[PDB]
Amino acid sequence: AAQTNAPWGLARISSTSPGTSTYYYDESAGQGSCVYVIDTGIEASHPEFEGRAQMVKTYYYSSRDGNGHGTHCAGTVGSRTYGVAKKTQLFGVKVLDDNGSGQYSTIIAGMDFVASDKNNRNCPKGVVASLSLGGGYSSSVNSAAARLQSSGVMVAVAAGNNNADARNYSPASEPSVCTVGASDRYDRRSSFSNYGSVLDIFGPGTDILSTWIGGSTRSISGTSMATPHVAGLAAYLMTLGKTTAASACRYIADTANKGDLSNIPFGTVNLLAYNNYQA
Numbered sequence: 001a002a003q004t005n006a007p008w009g010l011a012r013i014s015s016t017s018p019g020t021s022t023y024y025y026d027e028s029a030g031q032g033s034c035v036y037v038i039d040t041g042i043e044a045s046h047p048e049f050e051g052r053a054q055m056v057k058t059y060y061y062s063s064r065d066g067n068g069h070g071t072h073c074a075g076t077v078g079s080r081t082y083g084v085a086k087k088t089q090l091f092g093v094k095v096l097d098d099n100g101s102g103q104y105s106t107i108i109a110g111m112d113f114v115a116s117d118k119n120n121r122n123c124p125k126g127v128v129a130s131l132s133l134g135g136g137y138s139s140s141v142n143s144a145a146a147r148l149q150s151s152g153v154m155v156a157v158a159a160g161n162n163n164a165d166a167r168n169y170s171p172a173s174e175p176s177v178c179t180v181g182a183s184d185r186y187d188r189r190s191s192f193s194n195y196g197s198v199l200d201i202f203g204p205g206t207d208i209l210s211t212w213i214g215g216s217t218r219s220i221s222g223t224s225m226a227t228p229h230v231a232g233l234a235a236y237l238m239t240l241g242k243t244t245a246a247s248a249c250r251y252i253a254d255t256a257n258k259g260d261l262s263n264i265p266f267g268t269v270n271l272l273a274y275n276n277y278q279a
Contacts, residue, residue, distance in 0.1 A: 003081075033123060037090060040096040042092035071212055077130055079210065173198050179200050
């Protein structure tokens with residue numbers, strides 16, 4: 001399948017070169033997979049989600065996304081226009097308040113929730129969790145992400161926006177999950193993107209168009225935007241049967257575009273997420 005005039009990041013993940021604007025992908029499109037977006041919520045009523053999104057858990061007075069961040073990330077995973085995996089099922093877990101903030105204890109509870117809750121959902125092609133959030137190093141936060149991954153969920157986490165080594169941030173620093181840095185449309189490391197040995201992969205993160213609350217759209221930047229590209233890619237590849245939740249981060253790294261990014265510090269992987277789809 002071909003989506004013309006796609007957001008640059010979608011075009012980038014199906015291309016061997018920057019500078020194109022059509023997204024190419026197998027029509028299976030993540031059907032039969034599920035992606036949890038652990039964030040500020042999801043405006044599931046947005047036409048872009050086509051009934052495929054739902055809120056399943058909140059730790060606050062509403063499950064609504066009063067911020068926009070979670071809706072944007074969910075749109076990059078799986079919205080019809082802005083999403084990588086256009087037929088996946090999206091499940092929102094609201095661990096962040098409407099200011100985008102949240103206590104680590106709530107974030108940990110949300111991860112353990114997903115590990116159990118997947119047993120209440122129909123995801124025959126597999127389960128992914130996208131975590132566009134983080135703070136300072138916490139062994140307890142890392143352990144929760146490790147448990148979620150161990151339970152059979154492909155966990156993708158944002159590297160962080162400090163232009164620093166991600167070793168000092170959580171869950172970015174957990175070795176067993178997929179830690180995602182950000183790139184721009186000219187294949188430069190995004191100026192804010194964290195780096196370091198703990199990164200597994202880069203995805204598009206500067207000037208990413210996606211869904212927003214109020215049935216709208218906007219373009220914003222962050223490793224929060226790169227992470228759902230990778231989460232959606234994992235769901236897409238699992239539906240295709242090319243990999244599994246336990247193996248998807250390694251498979252994505254194996255099949256990535258290699259050596260094409262600029263300003264990658266020595267010792268950080270130079271790997272850009274790529275679906276290797278041949279129309």
